[PDB]
PDB file of C-alpha atoms in Angstrom:
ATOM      1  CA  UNK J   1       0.000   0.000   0.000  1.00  0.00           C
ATOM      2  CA  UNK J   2       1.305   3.459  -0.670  1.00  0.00           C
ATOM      3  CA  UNK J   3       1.594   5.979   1.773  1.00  0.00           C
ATOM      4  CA  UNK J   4      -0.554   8.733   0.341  1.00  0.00           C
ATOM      5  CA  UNK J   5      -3.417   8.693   2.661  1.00  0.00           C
ATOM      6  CA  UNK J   6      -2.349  12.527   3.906  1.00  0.00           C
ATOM      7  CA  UNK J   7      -2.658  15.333   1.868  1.00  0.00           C
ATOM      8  CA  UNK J   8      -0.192  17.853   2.248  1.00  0.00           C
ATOM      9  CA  UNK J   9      -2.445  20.056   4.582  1.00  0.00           C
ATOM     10  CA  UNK J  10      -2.538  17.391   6.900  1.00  0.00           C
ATOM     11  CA  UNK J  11       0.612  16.631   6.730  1.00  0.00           C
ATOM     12  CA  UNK J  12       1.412  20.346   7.911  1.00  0.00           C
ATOM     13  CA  UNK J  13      -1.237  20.132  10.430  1.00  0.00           C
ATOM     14  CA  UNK J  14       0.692  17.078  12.163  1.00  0.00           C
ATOM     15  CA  UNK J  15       3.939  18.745  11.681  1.00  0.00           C
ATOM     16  CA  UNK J  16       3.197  21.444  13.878  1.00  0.00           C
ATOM     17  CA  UNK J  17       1.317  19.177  16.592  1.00  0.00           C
ATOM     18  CA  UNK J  18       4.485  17.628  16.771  1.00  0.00           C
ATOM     19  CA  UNK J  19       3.893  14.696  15.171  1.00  0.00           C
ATOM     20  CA  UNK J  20       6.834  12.293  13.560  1.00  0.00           C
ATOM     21  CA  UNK J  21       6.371   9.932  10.590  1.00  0.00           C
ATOM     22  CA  UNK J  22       6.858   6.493  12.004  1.00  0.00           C
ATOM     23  CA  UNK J  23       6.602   2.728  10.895  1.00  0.00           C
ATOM     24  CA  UNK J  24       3.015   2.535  12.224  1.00  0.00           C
ATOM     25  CA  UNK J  25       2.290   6.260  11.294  1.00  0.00           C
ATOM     26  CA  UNK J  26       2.350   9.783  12.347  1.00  0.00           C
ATOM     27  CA  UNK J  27       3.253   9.094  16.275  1.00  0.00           C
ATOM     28  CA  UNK J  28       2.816  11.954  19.036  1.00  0.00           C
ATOM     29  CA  UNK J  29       4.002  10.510  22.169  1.00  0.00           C
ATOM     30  CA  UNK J  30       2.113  12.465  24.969  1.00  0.00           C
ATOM     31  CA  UNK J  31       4.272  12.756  28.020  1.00  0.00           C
ATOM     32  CA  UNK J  32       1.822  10.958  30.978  1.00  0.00           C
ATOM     33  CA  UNK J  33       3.668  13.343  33.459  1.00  0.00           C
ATOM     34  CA  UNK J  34       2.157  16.162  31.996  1.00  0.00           C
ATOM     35  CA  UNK J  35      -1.312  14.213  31.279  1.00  0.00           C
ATOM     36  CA  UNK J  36      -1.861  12.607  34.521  1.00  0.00           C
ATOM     37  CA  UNK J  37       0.288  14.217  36.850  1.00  0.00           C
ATOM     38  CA  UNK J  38       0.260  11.975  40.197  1.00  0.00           C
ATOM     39  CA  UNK J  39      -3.228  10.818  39.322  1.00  0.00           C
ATOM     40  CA  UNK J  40      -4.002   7.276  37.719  1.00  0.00           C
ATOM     41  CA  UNK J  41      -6.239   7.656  34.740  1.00  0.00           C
ATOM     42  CA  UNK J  42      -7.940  10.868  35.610  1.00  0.00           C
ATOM     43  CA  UNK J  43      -6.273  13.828  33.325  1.00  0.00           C
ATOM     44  CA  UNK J  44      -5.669  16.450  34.997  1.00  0.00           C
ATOM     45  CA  UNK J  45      -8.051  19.431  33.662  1.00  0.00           C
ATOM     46  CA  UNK J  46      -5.571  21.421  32.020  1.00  0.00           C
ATOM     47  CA  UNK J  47      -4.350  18.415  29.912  1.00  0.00           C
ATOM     48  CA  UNK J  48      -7.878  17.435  28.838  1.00  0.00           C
ATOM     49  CA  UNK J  49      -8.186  21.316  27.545  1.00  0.00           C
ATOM     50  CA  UNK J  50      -4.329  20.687  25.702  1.00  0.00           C
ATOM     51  CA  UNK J  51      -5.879  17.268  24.206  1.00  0.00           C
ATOM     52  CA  UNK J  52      -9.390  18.766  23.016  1.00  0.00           C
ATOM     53  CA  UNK J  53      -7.383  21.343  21.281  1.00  0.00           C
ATOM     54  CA  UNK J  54      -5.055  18.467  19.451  1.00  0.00           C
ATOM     55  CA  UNK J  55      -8.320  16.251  18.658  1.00  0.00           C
ATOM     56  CA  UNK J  56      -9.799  19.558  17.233  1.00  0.00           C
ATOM     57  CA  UNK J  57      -6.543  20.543  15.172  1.00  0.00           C
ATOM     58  CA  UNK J  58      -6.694  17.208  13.681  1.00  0.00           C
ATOM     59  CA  UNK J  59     -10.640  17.396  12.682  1.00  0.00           C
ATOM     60  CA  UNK J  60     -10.733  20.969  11.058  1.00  0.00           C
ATOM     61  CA  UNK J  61      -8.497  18.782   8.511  1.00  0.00           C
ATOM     62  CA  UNK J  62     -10.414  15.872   8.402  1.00  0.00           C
ATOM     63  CA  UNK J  63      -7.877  13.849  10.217  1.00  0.00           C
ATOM     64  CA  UNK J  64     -10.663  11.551  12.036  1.00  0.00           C
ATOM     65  CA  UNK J  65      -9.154   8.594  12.786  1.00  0.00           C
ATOM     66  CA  UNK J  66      -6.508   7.774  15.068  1.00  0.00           C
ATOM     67  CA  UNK J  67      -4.992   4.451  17.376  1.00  0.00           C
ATOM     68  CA  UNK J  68      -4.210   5.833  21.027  1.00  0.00           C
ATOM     69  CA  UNK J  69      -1.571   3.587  22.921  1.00  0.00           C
ATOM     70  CA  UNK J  70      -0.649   3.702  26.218  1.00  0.00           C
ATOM     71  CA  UNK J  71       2.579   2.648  27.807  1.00  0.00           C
ATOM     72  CA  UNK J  72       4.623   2.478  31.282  1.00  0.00           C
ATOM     73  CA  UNK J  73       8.270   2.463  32.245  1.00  0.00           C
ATOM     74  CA  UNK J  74       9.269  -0.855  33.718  1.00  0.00           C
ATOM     75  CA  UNK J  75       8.708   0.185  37.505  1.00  0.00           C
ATOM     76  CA  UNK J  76       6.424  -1.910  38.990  1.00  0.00           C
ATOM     77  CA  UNK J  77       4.353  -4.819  38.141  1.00  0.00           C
ATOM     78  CA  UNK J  78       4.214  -5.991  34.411  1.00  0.00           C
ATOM     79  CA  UNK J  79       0.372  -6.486  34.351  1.00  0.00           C
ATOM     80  CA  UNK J  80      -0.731  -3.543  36.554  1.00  0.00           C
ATOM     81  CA  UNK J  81       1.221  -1.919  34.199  1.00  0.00           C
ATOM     82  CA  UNK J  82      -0.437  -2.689  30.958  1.00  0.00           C
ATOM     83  CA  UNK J  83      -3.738  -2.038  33.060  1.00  0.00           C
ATOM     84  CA  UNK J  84      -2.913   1.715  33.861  1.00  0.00           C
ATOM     85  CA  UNK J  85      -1.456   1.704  30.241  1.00  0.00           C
ATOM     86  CA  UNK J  86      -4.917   0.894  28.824  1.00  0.00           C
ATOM     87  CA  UNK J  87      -6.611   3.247  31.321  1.00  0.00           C
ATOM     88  CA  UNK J  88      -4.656   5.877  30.316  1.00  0.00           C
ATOM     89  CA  UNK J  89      -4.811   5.520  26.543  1.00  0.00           C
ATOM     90  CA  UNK J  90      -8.682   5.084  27.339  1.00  0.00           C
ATOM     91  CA  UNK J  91      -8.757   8.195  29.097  1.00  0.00           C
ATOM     92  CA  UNK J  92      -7.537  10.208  26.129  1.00  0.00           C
ATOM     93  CA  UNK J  93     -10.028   8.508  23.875  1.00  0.00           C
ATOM     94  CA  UNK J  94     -12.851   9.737  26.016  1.00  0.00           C
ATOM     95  CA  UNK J  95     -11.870  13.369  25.206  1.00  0.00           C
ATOM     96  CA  UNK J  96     -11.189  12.872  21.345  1.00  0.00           C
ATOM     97  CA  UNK J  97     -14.785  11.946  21.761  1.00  0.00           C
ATOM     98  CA  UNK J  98     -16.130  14.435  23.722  1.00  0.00           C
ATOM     99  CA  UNK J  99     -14.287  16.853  20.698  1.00  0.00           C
ATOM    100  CA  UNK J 100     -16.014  14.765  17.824  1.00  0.00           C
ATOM    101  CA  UNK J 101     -13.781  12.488  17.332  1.00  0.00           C
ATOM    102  CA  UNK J 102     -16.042   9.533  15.792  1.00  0.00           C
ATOM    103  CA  UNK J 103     -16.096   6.841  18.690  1.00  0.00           C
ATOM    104  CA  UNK J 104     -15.961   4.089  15.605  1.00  0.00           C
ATOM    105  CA  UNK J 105     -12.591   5.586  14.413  1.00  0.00           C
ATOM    106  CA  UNK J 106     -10.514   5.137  17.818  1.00  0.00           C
ATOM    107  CA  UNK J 107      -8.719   2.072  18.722  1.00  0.00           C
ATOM    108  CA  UNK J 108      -7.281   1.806  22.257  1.00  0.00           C
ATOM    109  CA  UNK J 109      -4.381  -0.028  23.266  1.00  0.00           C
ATOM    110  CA  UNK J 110      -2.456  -0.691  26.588  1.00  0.00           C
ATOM    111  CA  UNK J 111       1.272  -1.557  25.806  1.00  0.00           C
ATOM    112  CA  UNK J 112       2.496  -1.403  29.433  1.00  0.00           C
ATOM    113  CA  UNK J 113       6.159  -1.826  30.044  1.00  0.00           C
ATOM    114  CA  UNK J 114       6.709  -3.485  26.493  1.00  0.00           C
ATOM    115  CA  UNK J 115       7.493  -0.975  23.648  1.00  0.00           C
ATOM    116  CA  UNK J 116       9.797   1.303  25.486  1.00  0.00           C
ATOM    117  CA  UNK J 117      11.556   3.939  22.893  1.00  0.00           C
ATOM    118  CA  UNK J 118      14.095   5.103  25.897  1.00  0.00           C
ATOM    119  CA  UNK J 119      16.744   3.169  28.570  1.00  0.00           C
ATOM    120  CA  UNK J 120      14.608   2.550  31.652  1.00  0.00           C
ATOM    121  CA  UNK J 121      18.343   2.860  33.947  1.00  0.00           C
ATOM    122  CA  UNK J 122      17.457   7.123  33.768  1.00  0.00           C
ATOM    123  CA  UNK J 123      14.880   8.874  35.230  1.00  0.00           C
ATOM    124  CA  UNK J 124      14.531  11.053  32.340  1.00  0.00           C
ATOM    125  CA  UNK J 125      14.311   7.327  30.023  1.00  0.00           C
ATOM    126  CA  UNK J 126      11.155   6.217  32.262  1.00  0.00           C
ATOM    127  CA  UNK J 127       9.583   9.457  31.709  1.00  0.00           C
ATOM    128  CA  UNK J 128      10.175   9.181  28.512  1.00  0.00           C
ATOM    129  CA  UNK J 129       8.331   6.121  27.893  1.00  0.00           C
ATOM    130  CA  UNK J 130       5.299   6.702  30.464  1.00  0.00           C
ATOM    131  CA  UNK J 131       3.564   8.220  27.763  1.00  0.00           C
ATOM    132  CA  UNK J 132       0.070   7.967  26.215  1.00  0.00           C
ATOM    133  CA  UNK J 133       0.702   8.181  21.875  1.00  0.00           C
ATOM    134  CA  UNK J 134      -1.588   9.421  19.278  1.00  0.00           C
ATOM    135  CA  UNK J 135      -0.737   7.137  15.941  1.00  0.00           C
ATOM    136  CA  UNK J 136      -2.457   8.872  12.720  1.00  0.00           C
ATOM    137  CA  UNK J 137      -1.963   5.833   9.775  1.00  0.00           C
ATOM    138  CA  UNK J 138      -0.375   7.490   6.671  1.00  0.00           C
ATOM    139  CA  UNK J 139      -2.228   5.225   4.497  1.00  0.00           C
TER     140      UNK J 139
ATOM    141  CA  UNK U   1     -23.099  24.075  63.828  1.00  0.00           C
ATOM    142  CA  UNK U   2     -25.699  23.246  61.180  1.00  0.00           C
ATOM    143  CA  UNK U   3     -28.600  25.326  60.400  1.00  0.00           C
ATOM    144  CA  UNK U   4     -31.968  23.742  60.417  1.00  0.00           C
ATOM    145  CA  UNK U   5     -32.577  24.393  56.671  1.00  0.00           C
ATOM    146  CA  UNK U   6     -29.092  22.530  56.055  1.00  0.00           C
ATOM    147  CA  UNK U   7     -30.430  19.686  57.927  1.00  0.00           C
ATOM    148  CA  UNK U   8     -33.432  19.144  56.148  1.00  0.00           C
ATOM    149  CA  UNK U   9     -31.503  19.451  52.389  1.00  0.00           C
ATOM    150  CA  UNK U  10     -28.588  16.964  53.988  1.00  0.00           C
ATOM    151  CA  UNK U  11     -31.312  14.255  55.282  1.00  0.00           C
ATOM    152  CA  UNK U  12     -33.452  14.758  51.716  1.00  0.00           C
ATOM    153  CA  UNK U  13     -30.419  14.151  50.226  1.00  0.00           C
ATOM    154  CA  UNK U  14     -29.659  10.611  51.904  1.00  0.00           C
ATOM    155  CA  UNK U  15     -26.947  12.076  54.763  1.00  0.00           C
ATOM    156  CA  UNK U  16     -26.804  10.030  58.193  1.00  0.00           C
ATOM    157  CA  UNK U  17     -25.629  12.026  61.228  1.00  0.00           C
ATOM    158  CA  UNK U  18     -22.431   9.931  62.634  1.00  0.00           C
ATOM    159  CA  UNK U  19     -20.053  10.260  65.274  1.00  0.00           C
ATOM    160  CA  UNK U  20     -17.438  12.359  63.148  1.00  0.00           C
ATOM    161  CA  UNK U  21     -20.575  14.225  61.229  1.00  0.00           C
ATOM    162  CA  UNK U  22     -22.780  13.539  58.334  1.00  0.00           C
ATOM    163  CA  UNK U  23     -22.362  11.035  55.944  1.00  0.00           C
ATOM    164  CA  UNK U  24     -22.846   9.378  52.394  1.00  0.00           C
ATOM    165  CA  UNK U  25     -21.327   6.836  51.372  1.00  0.00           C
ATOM    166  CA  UNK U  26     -21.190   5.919  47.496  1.00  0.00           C
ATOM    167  CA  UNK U  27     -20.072   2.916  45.692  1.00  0.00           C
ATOM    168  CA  UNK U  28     -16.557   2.422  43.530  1.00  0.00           C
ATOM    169  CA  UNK U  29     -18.137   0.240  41.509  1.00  0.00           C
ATOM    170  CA  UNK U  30     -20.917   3.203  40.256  1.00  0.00           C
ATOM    171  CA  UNK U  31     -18.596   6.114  40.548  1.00  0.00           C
ATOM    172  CA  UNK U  32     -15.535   4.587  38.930  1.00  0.00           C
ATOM    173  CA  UNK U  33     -16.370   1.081  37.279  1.00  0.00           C
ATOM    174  CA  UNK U  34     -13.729  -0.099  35.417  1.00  0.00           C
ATOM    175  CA  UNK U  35     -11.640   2.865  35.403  1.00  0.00           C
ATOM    176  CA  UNK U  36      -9.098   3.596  38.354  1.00  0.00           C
ATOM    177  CA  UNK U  37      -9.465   7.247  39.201  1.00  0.00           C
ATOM    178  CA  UNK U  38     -11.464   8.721  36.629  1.00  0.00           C
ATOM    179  CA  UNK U  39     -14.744   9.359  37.099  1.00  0.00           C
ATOM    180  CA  UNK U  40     -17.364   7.999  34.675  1.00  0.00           C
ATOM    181  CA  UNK U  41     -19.570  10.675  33.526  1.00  0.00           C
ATOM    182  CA  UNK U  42     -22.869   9.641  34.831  1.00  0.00           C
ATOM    183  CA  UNK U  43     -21.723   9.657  38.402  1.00  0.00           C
ATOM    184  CA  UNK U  44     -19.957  12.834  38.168  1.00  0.00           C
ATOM    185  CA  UNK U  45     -23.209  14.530  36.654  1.00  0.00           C
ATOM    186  CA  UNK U  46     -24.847  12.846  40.385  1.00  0.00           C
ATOM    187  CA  UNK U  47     -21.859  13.976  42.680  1.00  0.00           C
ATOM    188  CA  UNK U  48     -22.388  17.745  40.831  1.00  0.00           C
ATOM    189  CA  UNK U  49     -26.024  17.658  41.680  1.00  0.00           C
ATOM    190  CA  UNK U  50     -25.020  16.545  45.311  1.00  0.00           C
ATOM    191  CA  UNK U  51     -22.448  19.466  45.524  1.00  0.00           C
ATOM    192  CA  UNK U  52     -25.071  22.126  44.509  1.00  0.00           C
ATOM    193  CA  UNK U  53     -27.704  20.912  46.426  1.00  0.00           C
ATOM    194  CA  UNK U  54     -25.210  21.318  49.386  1.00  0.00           C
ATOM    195  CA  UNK U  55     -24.189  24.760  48.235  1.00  0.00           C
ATOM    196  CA  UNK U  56     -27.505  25.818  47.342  1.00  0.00           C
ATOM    197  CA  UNK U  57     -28.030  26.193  51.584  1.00  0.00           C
ATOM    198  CA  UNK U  58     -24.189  27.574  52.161  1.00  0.00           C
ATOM    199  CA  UNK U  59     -22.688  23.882  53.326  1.00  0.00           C
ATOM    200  CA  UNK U  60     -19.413  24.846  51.822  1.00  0.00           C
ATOM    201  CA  UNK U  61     -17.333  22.514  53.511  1.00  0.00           C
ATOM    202  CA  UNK U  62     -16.680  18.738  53.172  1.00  0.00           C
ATOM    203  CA  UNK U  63     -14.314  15.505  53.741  1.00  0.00           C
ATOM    204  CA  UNK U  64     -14.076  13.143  51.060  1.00  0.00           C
ATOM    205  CA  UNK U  65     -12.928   9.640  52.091  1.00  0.00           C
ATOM    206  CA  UNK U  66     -11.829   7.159  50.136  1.00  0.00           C
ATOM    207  CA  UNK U  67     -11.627   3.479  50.891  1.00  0.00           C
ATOM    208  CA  UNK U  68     -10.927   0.147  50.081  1.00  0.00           C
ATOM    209  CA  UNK U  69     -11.545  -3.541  50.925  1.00  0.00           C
ATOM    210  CA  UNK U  70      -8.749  -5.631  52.013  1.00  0.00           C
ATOM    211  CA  UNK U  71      -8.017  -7.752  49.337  1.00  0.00           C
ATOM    212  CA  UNK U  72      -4.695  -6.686  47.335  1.00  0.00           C
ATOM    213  CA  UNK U  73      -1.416  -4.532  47.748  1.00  0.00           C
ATOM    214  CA  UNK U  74      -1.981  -2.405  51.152  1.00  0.00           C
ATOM    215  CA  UNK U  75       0.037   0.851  49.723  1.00  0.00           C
ATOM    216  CA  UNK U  76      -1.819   0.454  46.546  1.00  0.00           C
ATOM    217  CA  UNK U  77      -4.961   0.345  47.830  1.00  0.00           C
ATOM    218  CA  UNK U  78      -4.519   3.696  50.264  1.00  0.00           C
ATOM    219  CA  UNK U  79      -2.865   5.782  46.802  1.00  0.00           C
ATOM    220  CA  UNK U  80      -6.043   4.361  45.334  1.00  0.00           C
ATOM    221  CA  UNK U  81      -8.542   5.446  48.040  1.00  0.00           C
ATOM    222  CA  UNK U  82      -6.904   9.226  48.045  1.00  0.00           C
ATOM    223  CA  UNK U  83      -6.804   9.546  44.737  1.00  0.00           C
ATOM    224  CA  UNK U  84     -10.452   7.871  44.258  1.00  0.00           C
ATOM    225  CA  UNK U  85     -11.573  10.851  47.235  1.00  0.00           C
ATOM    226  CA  UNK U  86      -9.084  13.574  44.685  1.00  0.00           C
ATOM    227  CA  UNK U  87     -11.353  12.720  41.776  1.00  0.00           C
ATOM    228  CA  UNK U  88     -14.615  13.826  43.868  1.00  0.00           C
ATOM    229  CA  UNK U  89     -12.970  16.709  44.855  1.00  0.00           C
ATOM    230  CA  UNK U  90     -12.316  17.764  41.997  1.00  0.00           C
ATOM    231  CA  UNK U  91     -16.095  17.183  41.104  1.00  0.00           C
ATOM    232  CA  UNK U  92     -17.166  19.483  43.882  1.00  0.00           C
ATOM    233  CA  UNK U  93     -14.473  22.204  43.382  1.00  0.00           C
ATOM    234  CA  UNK U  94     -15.848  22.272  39.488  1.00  0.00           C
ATOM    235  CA  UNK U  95     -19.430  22.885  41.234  1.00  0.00           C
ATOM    236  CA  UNK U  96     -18.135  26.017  43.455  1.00  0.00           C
ATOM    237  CA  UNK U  97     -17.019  24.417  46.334  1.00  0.00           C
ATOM    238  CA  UNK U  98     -14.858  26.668  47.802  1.00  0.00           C
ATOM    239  CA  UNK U  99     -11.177  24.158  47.167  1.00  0.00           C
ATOM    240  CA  UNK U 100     -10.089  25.200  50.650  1.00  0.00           C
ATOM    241  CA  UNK U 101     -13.219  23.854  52.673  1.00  0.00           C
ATOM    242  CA  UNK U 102     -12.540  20.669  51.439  1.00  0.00           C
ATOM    243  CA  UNK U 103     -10.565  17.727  52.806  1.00  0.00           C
ATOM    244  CA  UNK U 104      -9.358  14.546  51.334  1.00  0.00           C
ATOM    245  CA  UNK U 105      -8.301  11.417  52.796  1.00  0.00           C
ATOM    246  CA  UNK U 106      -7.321   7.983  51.148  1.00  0.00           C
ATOM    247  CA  UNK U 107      -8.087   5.603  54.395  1.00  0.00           C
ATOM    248  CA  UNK U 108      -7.515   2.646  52.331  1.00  0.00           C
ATOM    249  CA  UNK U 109      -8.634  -1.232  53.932  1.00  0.00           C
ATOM    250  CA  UNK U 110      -8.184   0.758  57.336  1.00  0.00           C
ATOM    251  CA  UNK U 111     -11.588   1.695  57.963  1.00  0.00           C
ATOM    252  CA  UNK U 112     -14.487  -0.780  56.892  1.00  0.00           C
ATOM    253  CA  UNK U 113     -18.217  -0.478  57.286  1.00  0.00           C
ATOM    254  CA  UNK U 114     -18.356  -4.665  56.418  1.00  0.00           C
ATOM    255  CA  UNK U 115     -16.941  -7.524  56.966  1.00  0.00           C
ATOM    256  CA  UNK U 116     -13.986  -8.265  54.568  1.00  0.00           C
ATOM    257  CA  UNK U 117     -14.420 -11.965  54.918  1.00  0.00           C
ATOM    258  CA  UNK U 118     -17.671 -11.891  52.973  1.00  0.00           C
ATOM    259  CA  UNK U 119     -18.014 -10.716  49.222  1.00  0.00           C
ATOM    260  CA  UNK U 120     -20.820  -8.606  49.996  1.00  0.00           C
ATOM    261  CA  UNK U 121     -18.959  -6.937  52.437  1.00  0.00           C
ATOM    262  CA  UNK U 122     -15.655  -6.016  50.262  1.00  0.00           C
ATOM    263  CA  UNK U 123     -17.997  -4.838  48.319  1.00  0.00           C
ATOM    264  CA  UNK U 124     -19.491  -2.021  50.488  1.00  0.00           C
ATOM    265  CA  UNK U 125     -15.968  -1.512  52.118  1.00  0.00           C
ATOM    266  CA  UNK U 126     -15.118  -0.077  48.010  1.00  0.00           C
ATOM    267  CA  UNK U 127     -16.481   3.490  48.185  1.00  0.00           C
ATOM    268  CA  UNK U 128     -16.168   7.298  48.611  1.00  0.00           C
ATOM    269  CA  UNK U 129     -17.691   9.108  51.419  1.00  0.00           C
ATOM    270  CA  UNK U 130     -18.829  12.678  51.415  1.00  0.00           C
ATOM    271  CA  UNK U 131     -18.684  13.953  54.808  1.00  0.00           C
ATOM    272  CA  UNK U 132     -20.463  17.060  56.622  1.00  0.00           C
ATOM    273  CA  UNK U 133     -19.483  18.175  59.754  1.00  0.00           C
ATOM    274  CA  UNK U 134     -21.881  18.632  62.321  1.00  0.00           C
TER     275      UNK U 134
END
């Protein structure tokens, strides 16, 4: 399949949401520091106001379907893990709803501790990978 | 302490007059189902209506309590609790609740209504309770 899904408005409109073309796709990994704070799946209110703006970005351009995937560092329990993971990334998809996101076009995964893109040894690694991603396919 | 209007509006509303003031209690299970601290949106459009019918006769000050059963990780289930008792908060500060008048406290498995050694029991011993002191 070729890659030409995305015209070059939406492209631009990814670009600047800070969006990078990936294997699976366009990938914005979401920082779940800044989402979540110290709570567990509840975002805090300022975040859901940053996401609804992101979800809206992406509709004015017709960008209206997207895979939301959660993941952990490796502190803690591997299957708790992929819980809050899945929690999280659900969390998110509640407020691409809420924006008009079509409920039919999300998919919501947990990857826990599993897909890390940083060294778990740093501080600064694990924060890295506690993060909740937006993947927009470029097909 | 409370007026006799703000009696009438906390009995209507399902309150019980306890030792440490009134209280009432709601279940995990309906306020957060399968999700950990997050609110789903039914319960926090009942928990709004319980925060203005409150403010609507100037009680502008609660304790939220959070609480567990026994089963599971003992630090877990405390973080859980407070943060379960945050999320309400939060629900009543978005309502006008003055953020200063209220309290919140994750109690954890320390502090059961029910018997833990029953199913029935854990179950009641998973909730949030809104408290009004008398």
């Amino acid at each position: 399949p070729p890659q030409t899904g995305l015209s070059a408005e939406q492209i631009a409109v990814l670009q600047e949401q800070g969006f990078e073309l990936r294997d699976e796709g366009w990938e914005f990994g979401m920082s779940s520091k800044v989402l979540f704070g110290n709570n567990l799946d509840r975002l805090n209110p300022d975040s859901r106001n940053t996401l609804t703006k992101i979800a809206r970005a992406l509709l004015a351009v017709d960008i209206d379907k997207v895979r939301l995937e959660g993941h952990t560092d490796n502190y803690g329990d591997e299957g708790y893990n992929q819980k809050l993971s899945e929690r999280r990334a659900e969390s998110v998809a509640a407020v691409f709803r809420e924006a008009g996101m079509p409920a039919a076009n999300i998919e919501v995964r947990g990857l826990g501790m599993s897909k890390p893109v940083a060294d778990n040894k740093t501080r600064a690694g694990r924060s890295e990978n506690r993060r909740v991603a937006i993947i927009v396919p470029a097909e």
